[PDB]
Amino acid sequence: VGSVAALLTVVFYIAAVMATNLYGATFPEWFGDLSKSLYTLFQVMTLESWSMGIVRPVMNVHPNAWVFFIPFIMLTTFTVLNLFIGIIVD
Amino acid sequence: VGSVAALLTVVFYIAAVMATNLYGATFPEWFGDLSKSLYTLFQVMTLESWSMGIVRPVMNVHPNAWVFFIPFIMLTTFTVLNLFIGIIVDAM
Amino acid sequence: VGSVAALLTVVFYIAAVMATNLYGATFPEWFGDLSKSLYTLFQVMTLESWSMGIVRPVMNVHPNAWVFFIPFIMLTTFTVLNLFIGIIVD
Amino acid sequence: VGSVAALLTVVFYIAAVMATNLYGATFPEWFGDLSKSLYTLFQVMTLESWSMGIVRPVMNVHPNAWVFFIPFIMLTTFTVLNLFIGIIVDAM
Ligand SMILES: CCCCCCCCCC(=O)N(CCO)C[C@@H](O)[C@@H](O)[C@@H](O)[C@@H](O)CO
Ligand SMILES: CCCCCCCCCC(=O)N(CCO)C[C@@H](O)[C@@H](O)[C@@H](O)[C@@H](O)CO
Ligand SMILES: CCCCCCCCCC(=O)N(CCO)C[C@@H](O)[C@@H](O)[C@@H](O)[C@@H](O)CO
Ligand SMILES: CCCCCCCCCC(=O)N(CCO)C[C@@H](O)[C@@H](O)[C@@H](O)[C@@H](O)CO
Ligand SMILES: [Br-]
Ligand SMILES: [Br-]
Numbered sequence A, C: 001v002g003s004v005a006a007l008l009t010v011v012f013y014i015a016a017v018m019a020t021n022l023y024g025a026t027f028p029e030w031f032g033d034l035s036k037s038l039y040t041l042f043q044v045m046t047l048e049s050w051s052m053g054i055v056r057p058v059m060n061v062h063p064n065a066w067v068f069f070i071p072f073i074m075l076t077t078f079t080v081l082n083l084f085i086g087i088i089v090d
Numbered sequence B, D: 001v002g003s004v005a006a007l008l009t010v011v012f013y014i015a016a017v018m019a020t021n022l023y024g025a026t027f028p029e030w031f032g033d034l035s036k037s038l039y040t041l042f043q044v045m046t047l048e049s050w051s052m053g054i055v056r057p058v059m060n061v062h063p064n065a066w067v068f069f070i071p072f073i074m075l076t077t078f079t080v081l082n083l084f085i086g087i088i089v090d091a092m
Helices: A004-023 A034-045 A050-059 A066-089 B004-023 B034-045 B050-059 B066-089 C004-023 C034-045 C050-059 C066-089 D004-023 D034-045 D050-059 D066-089
Strands: none
Touching (some): A004 A034, A050 D034, B004 B034, B004 B066, B050 B066, C034 C066, C034 D050, C050 C066, C066 D066, D034 D050, D034 D066, D050 D066
């Protein structure tokens, strides 16, 4: 659990660094600085408006943005759902 | 369960009190009274348009509103998911 | 499981009957007939756009509509999450 | 897990093939080719704007589209939730 939430903090920070670089200039409100990025990626992790709100408007400028976001979702969502069911049994 | 759902009820009322104060005058439709607040926070707990619908339009006036909402989400969401998985086992 | 999904079918049909009556005339696209109602309530059960999309536009005509929807959500969501974790162990 | 995720991959490809055919010409942005379809159906599996965003605008042209989408959701959502809860236990 302490390890799982260590992993996910690193994945979160690394993903927000990458996204700040990738989409910062084209999507300033969502990714213009690292703080805007950790927030948006938390939102994307909660699946809230991820495609209609974030990823489709992004794909109109970066057609392959799905290569970043979908695996990100798959990893954080699985890691969160592991952290939660971990803390419980623990 | 009985105690978990007591904790979550208190957290819920305290959060709705706090939010009524914090965002009530700037965001009356969502937080103008305690009843509007308990509803909106139930919605935020379900994750339904929490960011594009609530929190981003709020951060345009209160840039740190994320300090309230995100931990609220993390607490309730985890506590809810624990309450439900509790009830189930508690009948096994 | 067979019992749980019997309960939830009855709750679903009863809720869609009630909603067709309550919000049918004021909200025809969402509740104008029983079929429109079972669909909308499936959507509400998945939590998709439930408040910004359905319940808030409804509360502008029926202020207490939350008395119906919130318990409905609480019941179906708990029953679904019981049916799923049931089938698994079964 | 290895077999569950094989099943879900096949279901996913078959569904995206079917949807490309069914809704491709009426809804090109969402289903105009198999790649647009696999993406849109991943989104529908996450429940993200599935009804207000996808399925309701689709039912305005294909009134029975719900016969495809709802069972798709029920199948993938259940299978995904089974795959994840499988992996976890499979390492206990
Ligand atoms: C899992 C851990 C997730 C952690 C999430 C932390 C987010 C941090 C956000 C932050 O520090 N902000 C600055 C607050 O001063 C908010 C920014 O996102 C900001 O640039 C804008 O989004 C808004 O201010 C627009 O109104
Ligand atoms: C987990 C427990 C969550 C409990 C949630 C209780 C919500 C109570 C809402 C309520 O009592 N209202 C007043 C009913 O008279 C509705 C208000 O939220 C209202 O100000 C507006 O949202 C609408 O009327 C808009 O048209
Ligand atoms: C858990 C079980 C959930 C079952 C859900 C079943 C929904 C049945 C919907 C149905 O039979 N329709 C008629 C199809 O002919 C669709 C209606 O909802 C319709 O009145 C409109 O919504 C659209 O046609 C608008 O374009
Ligand atoms: C579970 C596995 C899910 C796999 C999902 C794969 C999606 C593949 C998407 C893809 O290959 N695209 C082409 C990239 O060149 C993107 C398309 O969906 C595209 O037609 C549009 O959506 C955007 O380009 C809009 O601007
Ligand atoms: Br809930
Ligand atoms: Br997923």
